Design a protein around this ligand. Structure first.
Ligand code: XX7
Ligand code: NAG
Ligand code: NAG
Ligand code: CO
Ligand code: CO
Length: 434
Protein backbone atom coordinates (compact mmCIF):
# COMPACT_ATOMS: atom_id res chain seq x y z
CA UNK A 1 0.00 0.00 0.00
CA UNK A 2 0.95 3.64 -0.46
CA UNK A 3 0.26 6.54 1.91
CA UNK A 4 -2.34 9.21 1.32
CA UNK A 5 -2.61 12.55 3.11
CA UNK A 6 -6.28 13.50 3.20
CA UNK A 7 -5.67 13.29 6.97
CA UNK A 8 -2.27 14.38 8.24
CA UNK A 9 -0.17 11.91 10.25
CA UNK A 10 1.43 13.38 13.41
CA UNK A 11 2.75 10.70 15.78
CA UNK A 12 2.11 11.54 19.42
CA UNK A 13 5.50 12.08 21.08
CA UNK A 14 6.71 9.78 23.85
CA UNK A 15 9.93 9.93 25.80
CA UNK A 16 11.67 7.10 27.55
CA UNK A 17 14.90 6.51 29.42
CA UNK A 18 17.94 4.67 28.22
CA UNK A 19 20.08 3.65 31.17
CA UNK A 20 23.68 2.51 31.32
CA UNK A 21 25.70 0.17 33.49
CA UNK A 22 27.56 3.12 34.98
CA UNK A 23 24.40 4.17 36.81
CA UNK A 24 22.88 7.02 34.83
CA UNK A 25 19.89 7.29 32.53
CA UNK A 26 19.39 9.68 29.62
CA UNK A 27 16.15 10.74 28.01
CA UNK A 28 15.26 9.54 24.52
CA UNK A 29 12.54 11.18 22.41
CA UNK A 30 10.36 8.92 20.30
CA UNK A 31 6.70 8.81 19.30
CA UNK A 32 3.96 6.26 18.76
CA UNK A 33 2.22 5.21 15.57
CA UNK A 34 -1.02 3.31 15.12
CA UNK A 35 -1.10 0.01 13.26
CA UNK A 36 -2.26 0.17 9.64
CA UNK A 37 -5.36 -2.01 10.27
CA UNK A 38 -6.98 0.78 12.23
CA UNK A 39 -6.59 3.27 9.38
CA UNK A 40 -8.84 4.34 6.57
CA UNK A 41 -7.84 2.45 3.42
CA UNK A 42 -8.98 4.21 0.25
CA UNK A 43 -8.31 4.70 -3.43
CA UNK A 44 -5.12 6.65 -4.14
CA UNK A 45 -6.91 9.28 -6.21
CA UNK A 46 -10.25 9.58 -4.37
CA UNK A 47 -12.04 9.09 -1.04
CA UNK A 48 -13.60 5.81 -2.20
CA UNK A 49 -13.03 3.09 0.40
CA UNK A 50 -10.95 0.02 -0.53
CA UNK A 51 -12.15 -1.61 2.69
CA UNK A 52 -15.31 -0.77 4.56
CA UNK A 53 -17.07 -2.58 7.34
CA UNK A 54 -15.60 -6.01 6.91
CA UNK A 55 -15.56 -6.29 3.14
CA UNK A 56 -13.21 -5.17 0.41
CA UNK A 57 -14.07 -3.27 -2.72
CA UNK A 58 -14.41 -5.95 -5.40
CA UNK A 59 -13.46 -3.40 -8.11
CA UNK A 60 -10.53 -1.64 -6.38
CA UNK A 61 -9.36 -4.92 -4.86
CA UNK A 62 -9.96 -7.84 -7.23
CA UNK A 63 -6.71 -9.48 -6.11
CA UNK A 64 -3.94 -8.76 -3.58
CA UNK A 65 -1.55 -6.98 -5.95
CA UNK A 66 -4.09 -4.81 -7.77
CA UNK A 67 -5.53 -3.80 -4.41
CA UNK A 68 -2.15 -2.63 -3.07
CA UNK A 69 -1.58 -0.65 -6.28
CA UNK A 70 -4.97 1.01 -6.13
CA UNK A 71 -5.08 1.70 -2.42
CA UNK A 72 -3.51 3.77 0.29
CA UNK A 73 -3.46 4.15 4.06
CA UNK A 74 -4.32 7.58 5.40
CA UNK A 75 -3.41 9.49 8.55
CA UNK A 76 -4.88 9.07 12.02
CA UNK A 77 -6.53 11.58 14.36
CA UNK A 78 -4.95 9.96 17.43
CA UNK A 79 -7.09 11.51 20.16
CA UNK A 80 -10.43 12.19 18.50
CA UNK A 81 -10.69 8.98 16.46
CA UNK A 82 -8.56 6.47 18.38
CA UNK A 83 -8.56 7.62 22.03
CA UNK A 84 -4.75 7.76 22.04
CA UNK A 85 -2.96 10.54 23.94
CA UNK A 86 0.55 11.08 25.22
CA UNK A 87 2.18 13.44 27.70
CA UNK A 88 5.93 13.34 28.21
CA UNK A 89 6.69 9.76 29.21
CA UNK A 90 3.01 8.68 29.51
CA UNK A 91 0.71 7.03 26.95
CA UNK A 92 -2.99 6.53 27.45
CA UNK A 93 -5.23 4.28 25.28
CA UNK A 94 -9.00 4.52 25.60
CA UNK A 95 -11.24 1.56 24.93
CA UNK A 96 -14.23 2.81 22.94
CA UNK A 97 -13.91 6.19 21.18
CA UNK A 98 -16.99 7.70 19.50
CA UNK A 99 -16.34 10.17 16.67
CA UNK A 100 -18.14 10.00 13.30
CA UNK A 101 -17.81 6.25 13.87
CA UNK A 102 -17.07 3.91 16.80
CA UNK A 103 -13.46 2.81 17.33
CA UNK A 104 -12.35 0.01 19.65
CA UNK A 105 -8.84 0.05 21.05
CA UNK A 106 -5.55 0.54 19.30
CA UNK A 107 -2.22 -1.22 18.64
CA UNK A 108 0.73 1.23 18.72
CA UNK A 109 4.47 0.97 18.00
CA UNK A 110 7.29 3.07 19.44
CA UNK A 111 9.16 4.94 16.71
CA UNK A 112 12.79 6.04 16.48
CA UNK A 113 12.00 8.64 13.79
CA UNK A 114 8.77 9.54 11.96
CA UNK A 115 9.58 6.85 9.40
CA UNK A 116 11.24 4.10 11.44
CA UNK A 117 10.44 1.88 14.41
CA UNK A 118 12.60 1.87 17.54
CA UNK A 119 14.41 -1.42 18.02
CA UNK A 120 15.36 -2.93 21.35
CA UNK A 121 17.81 -5.77 21.94
CA UNK A 122 16.34 -7.36 25.05
CA UNK A 123 19.01 -9.97 25.84
CA UNK A 124 21.23 -8.88 28.75
CA UNK A 125 18.96 -5.93 29.38
CA UNK A 126 15.88 -5.08 31.35
CA UNK A 127 12.73 -3.15 30.58
CA UNK A 128 10.81 -1.21 33.24
CA UNK A 129 7.51 0.55 33.00
CA UNK A 130 4.71 1.89 35.08
CA UNK A 131 1.13 0.95 34.46
CA UNK A 132 -2.29 1.92 35.64
CA UNK A 133 -4.66 -1.00 34.99
CA UNK A 134 -7.37 0.24 37.40
CA UNK A 135 -9.79 1.04 34.58
CA UNK A 136 -9.48 -2.40 32.95
CA UNK A 137 -12.21 -4.87 33.84
CA UNK A 138 -12.53 -8.53 32.93
CA UNK A 139 -12.35 -9.17 29.18
CA UNK A 140 -9.86 -6.40 28.36
CA UNK A 141 -6.13 -6.69 27.75
CA UNK A 142 -3.82 -3.71 28.10
CA UNK A 143 -0.70 -5.13 26.54
CA UNK A 144 2.92 -4.11 26.40
CA UNK A 145 5.05 -6.46 24.35
CA UNK A 146 7.76 -6.95 21.76
CA UNK A 147 7.68 -8.47 18.28
CA UNK A 148 10.39 -9.18 15.72
CA UNK A 149 9.26 -6.65 13.10
CA UNK A 150 11.41 -4.91 10.51
CA UNK A 151 12.39 -1.36 11.50
CA UNK A 152 11.02 0.03 8.22
CA UNK A 153 7.72 -1.79 8.45
CA UNK A 154 8.68 -4.00 5.46
CA UNK A 155 9.41 -1.39 2.77
CA UNK A 156 12.90 -2.64 1.83
CA UNK A 157 11.68 -6.20 1.29
CA UNK A 158 8.32 -5.26 -0.34
CA UNK A 159 8.59 -2.07 -2.42
CA UNK A 160 4.84 -2.06 -3.18
CA UNK A 161 4.59 -1.03 0.50
CA UNK A 162 5.65 2.60 0.33
CA UNK A 163 3.67 3.64 3.41
CA UNK A 164 5.98 1.87 5.89
CA UNK A 165 6.47 2.30 9.62
CA UNK A 166 5.19 5.90 9.38
CA UNK A 167 1.75 4.36 8.79
CA UNK A 168 2.20 1.32 11.03
CA UNK A 169 2.84 -1.38 8.45
CA UNK A 170 4.67 -4.64 8.92
CA UNK A 171 3.06 -6.14 12.00
CA UNK A 172 3.53 -9.75 12.97
CA UNK A 173 3.21 -11.82 16.11
CA UNK A 174 3.10 -15.41 17.34
CA UNK A 175 -0.54 -15.86 16.30
CA UNK A 176 0.53 -15.47 12.63
CA UNK A 177 -2.35 -13.01 12.37
CA UNK A 178 -4.50 -13.30 9.27
CA UNK A 179 -6.74 -10.32 10.11
CA UNK A 180 -4.17 -7.89 8.69
CA UNK A 181 -5.37 -6.13 5.59
CA UNK A 182 -1.89 -5.70 4.11
CA UNK A 183 0.98 -8.14 4.44
CA UNK A 184 4.27 -8.00 2.49
CA UNK A 185 3.12 -5.02 0.36
CA UNK A 186 0.06 -6.86 -0.92
CA UNK A 187 -3.52 -6.69 0.32
CA UNK A 188 -5.06 -9.74 2.01
CA UNK A 189 -8.34 -9.65 0.04
CA UNK A 190 -7.75 -13.08 -1.50
CA UNK A 191 -9.49 -15.65 0.70
CA UNK A 192 -11.07 -12.91 2.86
CA UNK A 193 -13.78 -14.17 5.23
CA UNK A 194 -15.68 -11.44 7.08
CA UNK A 195 -15.87 -12.11 10.83
CA UNK A 196 -19.22 -13.57 11.95
CA UNK A 197 -19.20 -11.46 15.17
CA UNK A 198 -17.32 -8.25 14.31
CA UNK A 199 -18.58 -5.71 11.81
CA UNK A 200 -15.08 -4.35 11.24
CA UNK A 201 -12.80 -7.37 10.83
CA UNK A 202 -12.13 -10.55 8.91
CA UNK A 203 -9.51 -13.18 8.14
CA UNK A 204 -7.55 -13.43 4.88
CA UNK A 205 -5.59 -16.03 3.02
CA UNK A 206 -2.23 -14.79 4.34
CA UNK A 207 -0.90 -14.26 7.84
CA UNK A 208 2.16 -12.60 9.31
CA UNK A 209 4.33 -14.56 11.76
CA UNK A 210 7.10 -13.63 14.12
CA UNK A 211 8.49 -14.07 17.62
CA UNK A 212 6.50 -12.38 20.37
CA UNK A 213 7.60 -11.36 23.86
CA UNK A 214 4.52 -10.67 25.93
CA UNK A 215 6.03 -8.75 28.80
CA UNK A 216 2.57 -7.63 29.99
CA UNK A 217 -0.90 -8.83 29.16
CA UNK A 218 -3.21 -7.69 31.89
CA UNK A 219 -6.24 -6.05 33.35
CA UNK A 220 -7.17 -5.18 36.95
CA UNK A 221 -7.85 -8.88 37.66
CA UNK A 222 -5.07 -10.88 35.91
CA UNK A 223 -1.63 -10.50 34.43
CA UNK A 224 0.74 -12.81 32.55
CA UNK A 225 4.32 -12.79 31.20
CA UNK A 226 4.70 -14.99 28.13
CA UNK A 227 7.45 -15.64 25.58
CA UNK A 228 6.31 -17.16 22.24
CA UNK A 229 9.02 -18.66 19.97
CA UNK A 230 8.72 -19.28 16.24
CA UNK A 231 10.93 -21.42 13.98
CA UNK A 232 11.56 -18.35 11.83
CA UNK A 233 12.50 -15.60 14.24
CA UNK A 234 11.42 -12.55 12.27
CA UNK A 235 8.51 -11.45 10.15
CA UNK A 236 7.39 -14.12 7.68
CA UNK A 237 4.22 -14.54 5.61
CA UNK A 238 2.19 -17.72 6.04
CA UNK A 239 -0.44 -19.40 3.84
CA UNK A 240 -3.99 -19.98 5.05
CA UNK A 241 -4.54 -22.69 7.64
CA UNK A 242 -0.81 -23.49 7.39
CA UNK A 243 -0.46 -20.34 9.44
CA UNK A 244 -1.59 -21.93 12.70
CA UNK A 245 -2.58 -19.37 15.34
CA UNK A 246 -5.99 -18.35 16.69
CA UNK A 247 -6.95 -17.09 13.19
CA UNK A 248 -6.75 -20.67 11.71
CA UNK A 249 -8.86 -23.80 12.26
CA UNK A 250 -5.73 -25.60 13.57
CA UNK A 251 -3.82 -23.37 16.04
CA UNK A 252 -0.75 -25.64 16.02
CA UNK A 253 -0.25 -26.21 12.29
CA UNK A 254 2.38 -23.50 11.84
CA UNK A 255 5.78 -21.96 12.54
CA UNK A 256 4.87 -20.07 15.72
CA UNK A 257 3.88 -21.07 19.20
CA UNK A 258 0.52 -19.39 19.83
CA UNK A 259 0.31 -20.49 23.47
CA UNK A 260 3.73 -19.59 24.87
CA UNK A 261 5.33 -20.36 28.22
CA UNK A 262 3.08 -18.18 30.30
CA UNK A 263 3.77 -17.15 33.86
CA UNK A 264 0.52 -16.01 35.52
CA UNK A 265 0.91 -15.95 39.31
CA UNK A 266 -2.80 -16.59 39.86
CA UNK A 267 -2.76 -19.56 37.49
CA UNK A 268 0.25 -20.94 39.40
CA UNK A 269 -1.65 -20.74 42.71
CA UNK A 270 -0.97 -17.39 44.28
CA UNK A 271 -4.42 -15.92 44.07
CA UNK A 272 -3.54 -13.13 46.54
CA UNK A 273 -0.71 -11.46 44.64
CA UNK A 274 -2.49 -9.19 42.17
CA UNK A 275 -5.90 -7.65 42.19
CA UNK A 276 -8.05 -4.70 43.18
CA UNK A 277 -7.69 -3.29 46.67
CA UNK A 278 -5.77 -3.83 49.87
CA UNK A 279 -6.38 -7.59 50.07
CA UNK A 280 -3.76 -8.18 47.32
CA UNK A 281 0.01 -7.87 47.44
CA UNK A 282 -0.17 -5.59 44.41
CA UNK A 283 -3.22 -3.30 44.45
CA UNK A 284 -4.44 -2.86 40.88
CA UNK A 285 -6.43 0.25 41.78
CA UNK A 286 -3.06 2.00 41.94
CA UNK A 287 -0.13 2.49 39.56
CA UNK A 288 2.60 -0.12 39.72
CA UNK A 289 6.06 -0.64 38.30
CA UNK A 290 6.91 -3.81 36.35
CA UNK A 291 10.53 -4.73 35.65
CA UNK A 292 11.52 -7.60 33.35
CA UNK A 293 15.08 -8.84 33.01
CA UNK A 294 16.45 -10.99 30.18
CA UNK A 295 19.52 -12.75 31.51
CA UNK A 296 21.89 -14.16 28.94
CA UNK A 297 21.00 -17.81 29.86
CA UNK A 298 17.67 -17.11 28.13
CA UNK A 299 15.69 -17.10 31.39
CA UNK A 300 13.47 -14.20 32.36
CA UNK A 301 13.33 -12.57 35.79
CA UNK A 302 10.67 -10.23 37.05
CA UNK A 303 10.04 -7.90 39.93
CA UNK A 304 7.45 -5.28 40.79
CA UNK A 305 7.49 -2.06 42.79
CA UNK A 306 4.47 -0.37 44.35
CA UNK A 307 4.66 2.52 46.84
CA UNK A 308 8.41 1.90 47.19
CA UNK A 309 8.04 -1.76 48.20
CA UNK A 310 9.74 -4.35 45.96
CA UNK A 311 8.37 -7.85 45.23
CA UNK A 312 10.08 -10.47 43.06
CA UNK A 313 7.78 -12.55 40.94
CA UNK A 314 6.13 -14.84 43.49
CA UNK A 315 7.52 -18.32 43.98
CA UNK A 316 5.69 -21.18 42.25
CA UNK A 317 5.97 -24.94 42.59
CA UNK A 318 4.90 -27.00 39.57
CA UNK A 319 5.97 -30.61 39.23
CA UNK A 320 9.68 -30.67 40.03
CA UNK A 321 10.12 -26.96 39.25
CA UNK A 322 10.34 -24.55 42.20
CA UNK A 323 11.27 -20.89 41.98
CA UNK A 324 10.39 -17.53 40.48
CA UNK A 325 12.56 -17.47 37.37
CA UNK A 326 10.92 -18.19 34.02
CA UNK A 327 13.44 -20.76 32.70
CA UNK A 328 13.65 -24.00 30.74
CA UNK A 329 12.73 -26.02 33.80
CA UNK A 330 9.62 -23.93 34.44
CA UNK A 331 8.38 -24.14 30.86
CA UNK A 332 8.96 -27.91 30.71
CA UNK A 333 7.18 -28.48 34.02
CA UNK A 334 4.36 -26.28 32.78
CA UNK A 335 3.85 -28.43 29.68
CA UNK A 336 4.05 -31.55 31.86
CA UNK A 337 1.51 -30.35 34.45
CA UNK A 338 -0.86 -28.16 32.42
CA UNK A 339 -0.44 -29.84 29.02
CA UNK A 340 0.74 -28.87 25.56
CA UNK A 341 3.82 -29.16 23.42
CA UNK A 342 3.68 -25.99 21.34
CA UNK A 343 6.32 -24.00 23.26
CA UNK A 344 8.79 -26.92 23.26
CA UNK A 345 7.97 -27.94 19.67
CA UNK A 346 9.01 -24.47 18.58
CA UNK A 347 12.35 -24.67 20.42
CA UNK A 348 11.52 -23.15 23.81
CA UNK A 349 13.67 -20.47 25.41
CA UNK A 350 16.68 -21.47 23.29
CA UNK A 351 14.78 -20.52 20.17
CA UNK A 352 13.30 -17.51 21.93
CA UNK A 353 16.80 -16.29 22.76
CA UNK A 354 17.32 -15.80 19.02
CA UNK A 355 14.55 -13.21 19.09
CA UNK A 356 15.79 -11.34 22.17
CA UNK A 357 19.39 -11.42 20.84
CA UNK A 358 18.17 -9.41 17.84
CA UNK A 359 16.06 -6.32 17.53
CA UNK A 360 12.39 -6.19 18.50
CA UNK A 361 9.76 -3.49 18.25
CA UNK A 362 7.82 -2.25 21.26
CA UNK A 363 4.04 -2.58 20.99
CA UNK A 364 1.44 -1.05 23.36
CA UNK A 365 -2.21 -1.94 22.89
CA UNK A 366 -5.67 -2.20 24.32
CA UNK A 367 -8.01 -4.86 23.00
CA UNK A 368 -10.96 -7.14 23.58
CA UNK A 369 -11.07 -10.70 22.27
CA UNK A 370 -13.58 -11.65 19.63
CA UNK A 371 -12.37 -15.28 19.59
CA UNK A 372 -12.27 -16.33 23.26
CA UNK A 373 -13.46 -13.33 25.35
CA UNK A 374 -10.02 -13.07 27.06
CA UNK A 375 -10.92 -16.13 29.17
CA UNK A 376 -7.47 -17.63 28.52
CA UNK A 377 -6.02 -14.70 30.49
CA UNK A 378 -8.48 -13.96 33.28
CA UNK A 379 -11.02 -16.77 33.70
CA UNK A 380 -11.36 -20.58 33.58
CA UNK A 381 -10.40 -21.92 30.17
CA UNK A 382 -11.73 -24.04 28.55
CA UNK A 383 -14.89 -22.98 30.37
CA UNK A 384 -16.14 -26.52 30.96
CA UNK A 385 -13.09 -27.24 33.13
CA UNK A 386 -12.96 -26.74 36.88
CA UNK A 387 -10.24 -25.93 39.41
CA UNK A 388 -9.55 -29.69 39.51
CA UNK A 389 -8.02 -29.40 36.03
CA UNK A 390 -4.43 -28.19 36.52
CA UNK A 391 -3.99 -24.69 35.17
CA UNK A 392 -7.55 -24.28 34.02
CA UNK A 393 -8.26 -21.30 36.34
CA UNK A 394 -6.22 -18.30 35.20
CA UNK A 395 -8.19 -15.66 37.04
CA UNK A 396 -11.36 -14.87 38.95
CA UNK A 397 -13.42 -13.47 36.07
CA UNK A 398 -16.65 -15.30 35.27
CA UNK A 399 -16.55 -17.68 32.32
CA UNK A 400 -19.43 -15.47 31.01
CA UNK A 401 -17.20 -12.35 30.97
CA UNK A 402 -15.56 -10.48 28.14
CA UNK A 403 -18.22 -10.64 25.43
CA UNK A 404 -16.93 -7.84 23.23
CA UNK A 405 -20.26 -6.16 22.47
CA UNK A 406 -21.09 -6.25 26.15
CA UNK A 407 -17.83 -4.87 27.50
CA UNK A 408 -17.80 -2.22 24.73
CA UNK A 409 -21.30 -1.20 25.77
CA UNK A 410 -20.71 -1.37 29.57
CA UNK A 411 -17.13 -0.19 29.86
CA UNK A 412 -16.48 2.25 26.97
CA UNK A 413 -14.40 4.55 29.16
CA UNK A 414 -12.00 1.79 30.14
CA UNK A 415 -8.40 2.72 29.48
CA UNK A 416 -4.78 1.78 30.11
CA UNK A 417 -1.93 4.13 30.85
CA UNK A 418 1.67 3.10 30.31
CA UNK A 419 4.38 5.44 31.51
CA UNK A 420 7.96 5.91 32.58
CA UNK A 421 9.55 3.42 30.23
CA UNK A 422 13.16 2.74 31.14
CA UNK A 423 15.51 0.39 29.35
CA UNK A 424 19.11 -0.64 29.86
CA UNK A 425 21.48 -3.22 31.22
CA UNK A 426 20.20 -5.51 33.92
CA UNK A 427 20.43 -3.67 37.26
CA UNK A 428 20.41 -0.20 35.68
CA UNK A 429 16.79 1.01 35.38
CA UNK A 430 16.15 1.80 39.05
CA UNK A 431 18.78 4.54 38.95
CA UNK A 432 17.73 8.16 38.54
CA UNK A 433 16.09 9.25 35.32
CA UNK A 434 18.01 11.96 33.45
O1 XX7 B 1 -1.86 -8.87 23.98
C1 XX7 B 1 -1.03 -8.87 22.79
C2 XX7 B 1 -1.40 -10.05 21.88
C3 XX7 B 1 -1.01 -9.80 20.44
O2 XX7 B 1 -1.39 -10.91 19.61
N1 XX7 B 1 -0.76 -11.30 22.38
C4 XX7 B 1 -1.63 -12.50 22.26
C5 XX7 B 1 -0.77 -13.77 22.43
O3 XX7 B 1 -0.07 -14.06 21.21
C6 XX7 B 1 -1.66 -14.94 22.79
O4 XX7 B 1 -2.78 -14.82 21.96
C7 XX7 B 1 -3.92 -15.56 22.17
C8 XX7 B 1 -3.91 -16.68 22.97
C9 XX7 B 1 -5.10 -17.41 23.12
C10 XX7 B 1 -5.07 -18.56 23.89
C11 XX7 B 1 -6.25 -19.29 24.08
C12 XX7 B 1 -7.43 -18.87 23.48
C13 XX7 B 1 -7.45 -17.72 22.70
C14 XX7 B 1 -6.29 -16.97 22.52
C15 XX7 B 1 -6.30 -15.81 21.73
C16 XX7 B 1 -7.46 -15.31 21.12
C17 XX7 B 1 -7.43 -14.15 20.35
C18 XX7 B 1 -6.23 -13.47 20.17
C19 XX7 B 1 -5.07 -13.97 20.76
C20 XX7 B 1 -5.09 -15.12 21.55
C1 NAG C 1 1.90 -14.57 47.01
O1 NAG C 1 3.08 -13.84 46.69
C2 NAG C 1 3.48 -12.88 47.64
C3 NAG C 1 4.71 -12.13 47.12
O2 NAG C 1 5.73 -13.08 46.88
C4 NAG C 1 3.79 -13.56 48.96
O3 NAG C 1 4.20 -12.62 49.90
C5 NAG C 1 2.51 -14.21 49.42
O4 NAG C 1 2.78 -14.76 50.70
C6 NAG C 1 2.11 -15.24 48.37
N1 NAG C 1 0.89 -15.95 48.78
C7 NAG C 1 0.58 -17.18 48.35
C8 NAG C 1 -0.80 -17.70 48.73
O5 NAG C 1 1.32 -17.90 47.67
C1 NAG D 1 -14.23 -30.04 28.38
O1 NAG D 1 -14.52 -30.22 27.01
C2 NAG D 1 -13.48 -30.82 26.24
C3 NAG D 1 -13.89 -30.90 24.77
O2 NAG D 1 -15.28 -31.08 24.64
C4 NAG D 1 -13.13 -32.21 26.79
O3 NAG D 1 -11.99 -32.70 26.13
C5 NAG D 1 -12.86 -32.13 28.29
O4 NAG D 1 -12.67 -33.42 28.83
C6 NAG D 1 -14.00 -31.42 29.01
N1 NAG D 1 -13.72 -31.37 30.44
C7 NAG D 1 -14.63 -31.62 31.38
C8 NAG D 1 -14.27 -31.22 32.79
O5 NAG D 1 -15.72 -32.16 31.16
CO1 CO E 1 -0.13 -16.57 -1.16
CO1 CO F 1 19.12 -16.98 36.49
Amino acid sequence: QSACTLQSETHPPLTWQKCSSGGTCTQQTGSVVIDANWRWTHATNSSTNCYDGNTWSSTLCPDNETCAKNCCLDGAAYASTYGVTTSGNSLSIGFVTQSAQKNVGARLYLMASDTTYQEFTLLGNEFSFDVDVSQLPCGLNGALYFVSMDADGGVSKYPTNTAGAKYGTGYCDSQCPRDLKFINGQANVEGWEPSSNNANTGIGGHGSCCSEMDIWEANSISEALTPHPCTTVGQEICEGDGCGGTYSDNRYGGTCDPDGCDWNPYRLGNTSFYGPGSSFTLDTTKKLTVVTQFETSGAINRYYVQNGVTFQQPNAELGSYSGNELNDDYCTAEEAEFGGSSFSDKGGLTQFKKATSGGMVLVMSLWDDYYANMLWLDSTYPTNETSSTPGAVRGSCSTSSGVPAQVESQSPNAKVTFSNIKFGPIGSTGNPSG
